[PDB]
Amino acid sequence: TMKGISSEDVPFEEDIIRNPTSVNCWQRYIDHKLQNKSPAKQMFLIYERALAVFERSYKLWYHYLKYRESTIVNKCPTDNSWRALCDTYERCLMRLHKMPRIWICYCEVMIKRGLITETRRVFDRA
Amino acid sequence: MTSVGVPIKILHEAEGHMVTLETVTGEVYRGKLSEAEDNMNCQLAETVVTFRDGRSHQLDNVFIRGNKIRFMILPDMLKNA
Amino acid sequence: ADLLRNIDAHYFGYLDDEDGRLIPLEKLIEEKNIERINKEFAEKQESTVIGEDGRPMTIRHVLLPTQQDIEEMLLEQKKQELMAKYLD
Amino acid sequence: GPLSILTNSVKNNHQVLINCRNNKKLLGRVKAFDRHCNMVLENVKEMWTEVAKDRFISKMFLRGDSVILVVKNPLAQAE
Amino acid sequence: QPVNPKPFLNSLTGKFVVCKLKWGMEYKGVLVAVDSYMNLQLAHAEEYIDGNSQGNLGEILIRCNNVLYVGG
Amino acid sequence: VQPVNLIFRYLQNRTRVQIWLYEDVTHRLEGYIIGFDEFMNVVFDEAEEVNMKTKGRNKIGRILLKGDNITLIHAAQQEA
Amino acid sequence: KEDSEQMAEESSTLHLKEAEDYQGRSFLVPPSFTGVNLREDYVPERCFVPKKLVHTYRGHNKGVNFLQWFPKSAHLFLSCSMDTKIKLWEVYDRQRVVRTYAGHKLPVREVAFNNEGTEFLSASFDRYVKLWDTETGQVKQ
Amino acid sequence: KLVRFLMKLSHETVNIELKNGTQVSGTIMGVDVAMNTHLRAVSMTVKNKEPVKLDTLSIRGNNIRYIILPDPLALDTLLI
Amino acid sequence: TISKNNKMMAHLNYRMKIILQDGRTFIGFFKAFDKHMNILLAECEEHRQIGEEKRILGLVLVRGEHIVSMTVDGPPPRD
Amino acid sequence: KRTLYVGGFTEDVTEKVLMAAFIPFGDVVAISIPMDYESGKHRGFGFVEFDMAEDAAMAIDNMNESELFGKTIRVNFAR
Amino acid sequence: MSKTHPPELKKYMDKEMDLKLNGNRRVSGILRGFDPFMNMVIDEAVEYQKDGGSVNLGMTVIRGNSVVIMEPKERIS
Amino acid sequence: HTIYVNNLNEKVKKDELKRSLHMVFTQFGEIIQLMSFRKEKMRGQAHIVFKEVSSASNALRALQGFPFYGKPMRIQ
Amino acid sequence: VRLTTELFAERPQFVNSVNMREINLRGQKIPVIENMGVTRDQFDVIDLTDNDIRKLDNFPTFSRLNTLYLHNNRINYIAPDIATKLPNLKTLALTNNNICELGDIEPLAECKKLEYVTFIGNPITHKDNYRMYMIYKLPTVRVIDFNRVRLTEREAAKKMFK
């Protein structure tokens, strides 16, 4: 389901509404969960929500992209979940296209998929 | 150039806060740290020692030699990284 | 430095893609890698736009609740537990 | 030097009898050398009181930092 | 004037000395040894503990760290 | 002041000093000194060892004591 | 010049600001701004190849013409100039400032400390030796 | 050279003894010279404690009192 | 894991358990490595046997000298 | 390593602009820009301290010579 | 690379301090000694015994590796 | 901020004196700096340091003549 | 001003003349004691003198806390469970407050390890049986209101209440 709240994110989710403009409020929200190994679909949502407010924050994009790669690592690189990771890099680059680390990681992700024909094109863009 | 000392860089980050350490004699120390050395010799400003039974004592300064000791615990603030 | 006088339209690849015969060869090596990773693993909205390099790409925009869709969900939740704690 | 004993003992294919700081004794043939006297032990018998217990070990490797004291038995028979 | 241990040992070398280990065991042995770790080697050694003889020993290997005595 | 120069002052006056040993050891030594090096090796002479198990004393003549085994050195006093 | 002439003429002046740091201890004998040995032996090890110049010590208007070392250390050195001034300098790869001593009508030629080290005597072509207290920075003989 | 034995010693199953009278049995899987000990398919037997099984184990080799080696291992070729 | 750089990187994103010289056992994540075996241990809990006891701890850096035994288990973490 | 020297930026670049340019490669916790008192402007250089040396390496390797306002900014190891 | 120098021992020297020895023996002494080997020289020192009375320690030499434990009585300013 | 104190009651223990005055002075203000001794010549005297001149006068007037351990203390 | 978590960071945390660890919260307009838990009992001494604290309650559980100073506050109520919160409290000085009843000492009396107290300036000194009641209720206490207890007063006190 797309809806649901718990006693242990009531505080953090409320804190973000009174403090709409501090990244650290999402970090306090994220970080305790990070300790608490818990469903990735929740974590992806909390990251994409944070990355909707603070779309130029490299830290959240870098940690989110590496987290998507981290949890998808158990799926074979042929899988569509690795395609979705690449589509997240394209959305990240719409803000952070001047940070080589995002481009470097994106290229390494294309290499891990084993593709060639447009792995080259990602390199040409970079 | 220099390229060495990653725990020492963390140890430098650990400076100024409170640390916990244990000694070969078996008792535990809690102290605020601002001293580091390549030979692991260290000195603590403000220190408390507590035994595993019920005895505790306060020490204002303690110096530690890096080669006849048990290891120290670094502050939580390092989780900033 | 002295590389800057040597960077040009060829360096950025504006003058290297009229040929296109590379793609069939790349496809051949690409599929063998796909089988190779499969074999190694065997033992273990949308939109469409002209992309940066002129070639069509797809963008998978996320659809997600905004704060107004979720500050009200937690509101109803917290009122229930407060009244429950007052009676019990 | 002290190696003289090692070399002549080793060269004459002798065994060494070893006694530990507390509980155990060892008997062995040698094939290792360094300034720290690291040893490799062969045809090893281990006996210690936890009743008498006996265990046989074919091959053993002993590091020179956990160092123990050696006793010689020349009337004992060779292999 | 005082003397360094190595020339001092030279006067002592070949003579009869008393030994004791940090663990509390005593030994008597003939000694010829020079090395960077300052180890000791004893030959055809007769063993005493608390001044009473236990056994006559043969060749023995002992690390320098546990031994700390030499005198007669 | 430093130990090597002070040892020169002890040996020049032949002061009697007490030495203790580290780790798992229980012995006390009372002795005069005549030895020197930068490595703080010690030549011990006219010495007496106290047995803490019995508080008895034995007299000892001229022994060498390796500096790494040595803990503290100080001018001896009576114990009973 | 004589005592009455030299005092009004301000032949010696004080300009140091760091006269103390964390404690009211002396600054000449101990190298208080260092962690190295406060007193040093004559020979640590077998000699090695030299390396590099630290700095030119630019600021002064004239030449330098004698050097002397401080007892039991190489951190601090004393210098004599044809400019009739005497100055101290720190040598262990450091560029901090030290206090100026001056009082000679003609160039200084040679300097010797007294064996206690808190005073030094200086020989000059003006045919006088004057007695300075290094900590005080004043003359009275 | 002795360094070759520590690096070459691998894949066989060994019994290990630790200073606290403790026994360990584990098979080795590692390729390095610095004596770093990594074990796989391990059984653990602490002194005065029941045996337990471990999927993987790593031990500081300097702490190990002595290692017991399997019967067919011709140690002579690894030491050279 | 120990010392070797490449082993350290492979073992990351695993739960890791430590047993020390005083018999207490610790479990902690790590994403740090010194080839002389110094690591930073985070989110740790210790267990004590008298009886049995558990304590909550602060974050730790560990010196290889004390570690007797280490083993790796558990599900992957976040990030 | 964790301390960077930053150089080559234009007169438009304030401390927050560098903050916006350097947190791309790790956590930045302070930036300082020494200002020249005679001109009333900065000397075109500033220092950055990172919490991690690895982040500072991903910040030298990927900011050194990077373009800010069209000028190649230089980022380097403070000697 | 670069390494580091010894600490600023001069800031703490000549104060009066207590020293601790293995086996829970206590010594109280004034300290004035330093060397690259980090040995220590103590003077005017007194020992407090666990199984007896007290004895006075006259100008003491200590090998640096063995003991270095201090509790000071004068607060640093 | 330095005063000389004499003729104090001899029964107060060293820590007890330190503790007793610490509770006395902390109520008057944020002043904590004292050194007291109990040896034969040292007895009946202590050294105390004040944070500020204004707090010292109020404390001094209150402590001047305050009965402590059955004796009225005096300050100079 | 409020005793929020940020106030504890900004205010001085310092070691006092008896080598104990102290945090300064003096005079911070505190009306009710709260948020002390962020300290997590890491301080040996808490100093709250000169504040506007109206009641002695709401303390978190502290075991390291040896001495507490609360002089000149506005305390008019003491929580009965204070002994469970501060069982190891050895010194508690409440000088110049307005504590009015012996009943207020009963929560303080449950703190079985309390040894030194001061109540000068409180109205309770005028109350009947003020002096004798403390002797009966607090036999472990060594010093009261900068005054000692005589051995004969316990005999006299026991004679009165028996």
From TrEMBL, chain A:
It is found in: Nucleus. Residues 8-126 form the Pre-mRNA-splicing factor Syf1-like N-terminal HAT-repeats domain. It comes from the Eukaryota. Belongs to the crooked-neck family. This is Pre-mRNA-splicing factor SYF1. It comes from Caenorhabditis elegans. The gene is syf-1. The chain holds residues 18 to 143 of 855 of the full protein.
From TrEMBL, chain G:
WD repeats lie at residues 57-99, 101-141. It is found in: Nucleus. This is Pre-mRNA-processing factor 17. It comes from Caenorhabditis elegans. The chain holds residues 215 to 355 of 567 of the full protein.
UniProtKB/TrEMBL annotation, chain H:
The chain holds residues 2 to 81 of 127 of the full protein. Transmembrane segments: none annotated. GO terms for cellular component: P granule; spliceosomal complex. This is Small nuclear ribonucleoprotein Sm D1. Keywords: Cytoplasm, mRNA processing, mRNA splicing, Nucleus, Ribonucleoprotein, Spliceosome. Residues 1-73 form the Sm domain. GO terms for biological process: spliceosomal snRNP assembly. It comes from the Eukaryota. Belongs to the snRNP core protein family. Plays a role in pre-mRNA splicing as a core component of the spliceosomal U1, U2, U4 and U5 small nuclear ribonucleoproteins (snRNPs), the building blocks of the spliceosome. The lineage of its organism: Eukaryota, Metazoa, Ecdysozoa, Nematoda, Chromadorea. It is found in: Cytoplasm; Nucleus. One of its GO terms (molecular function) is RNA binding.
From TrEMBL, chain J:
Residues 2-79 form the RRM domain. Catalyzes the cis-trans isomerization of proline imidic peptide bonds in proteins. Belongs to the cyclophilin-type PPIase family. PPIase E subfamily. This is Peptidyl-prolyl cis-trans isomerase E. It comes from Caenorhabditis elegans. The chain holds residues 10 to 88 of 331 of the full protein.
